[PDB]
Amino acid sequence: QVQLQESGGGLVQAGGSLRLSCAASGGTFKSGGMAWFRQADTNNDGWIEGDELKAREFAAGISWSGGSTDYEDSVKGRFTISRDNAKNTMYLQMNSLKPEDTAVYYCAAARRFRAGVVTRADDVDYWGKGTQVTVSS
Ligand SMILES: [Tb+3]
Numbered sequence: 530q531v532q533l534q535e536s537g538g539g540l541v542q543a544g545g546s547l548r549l550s551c552a553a554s555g556g557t558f559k560s561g562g563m564a565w566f567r568q569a570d571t572n573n574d575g576w577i578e579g580d581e582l583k584a585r586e587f588a589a590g591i592s593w594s595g596g597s598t599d600y601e602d603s604v605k606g607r608f609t610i611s612r613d614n615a616k617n618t619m620y621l622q623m624n625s626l627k628p629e630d631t632a633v634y635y636c637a638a639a640r641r642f643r644a645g646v647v648t649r650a651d652d653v654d655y656w657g658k659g660t661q662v663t664v665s666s
Contacts, residue, residue, distance in 0.1 A: 530555040531655045533636040537621075538660030543628050549621040549660060551636030561640040562597075563619045564590035564647050565610065567632040567662075575629055585650040588634065589621055592645030599646040604630075626664045633659035 537549035549565065568577045569584035589600045589610040598610050609622040619636065636657040639647035647653060 531638060533638055533655055533657035535634065535636050535657045535660040538634065538662045540663045540665060541626055543626060543664050543666050545626050545664075546622070546624045547626065547662060549623065549634055549662075551619045551657060553617040553619075553636075553638060556640075558593055558614070558617055558638065558640060560593055561638070561642040562590055562592045562645050562647050563612065563639070564588070564637045564653070565619075565621050565634050566637055566650060566653075567634045570629075577632055582633070585635065587648045587650075590646035590648060591619060593640075597645040599648065623662070626662075628664050628666055630662060631664045633661050635659045 532555045534552045537547055541547055565588045566585045567588050569586035570577055571581050571584050587601055589608050591598050591610045591612050595612045607625045612619045637653040638655040639653050642652055
């Protein structure tokens, strides 16, 4: 019954910014954390193609209180995660967007995660369907 609904993806010029949101419904979030994952460019060519649409990598994560965060190294100083516990919503502020930030971004919930910031896709219970971030040069 838990549902995660992302918004905020769009078409933006490189160097621009987007703010993603994830609204959680269908349960209580008083534990664990949530995270943003994105499609993984598993063959390291600079593009998502073929079956990489199903691959996932961690971007940013936050404990349920907002008290703890972590980030993939290559988004540090550019992206900021935050959460409004009273509204059960999580945000990703994406500044200084780069072309290779282009991907679907997925909201992920891990209410039972004991170290606050979930980083592995297998530890996630619930996934949103994503929002597509498209960065143009
Ligand atoms: Tb690729």
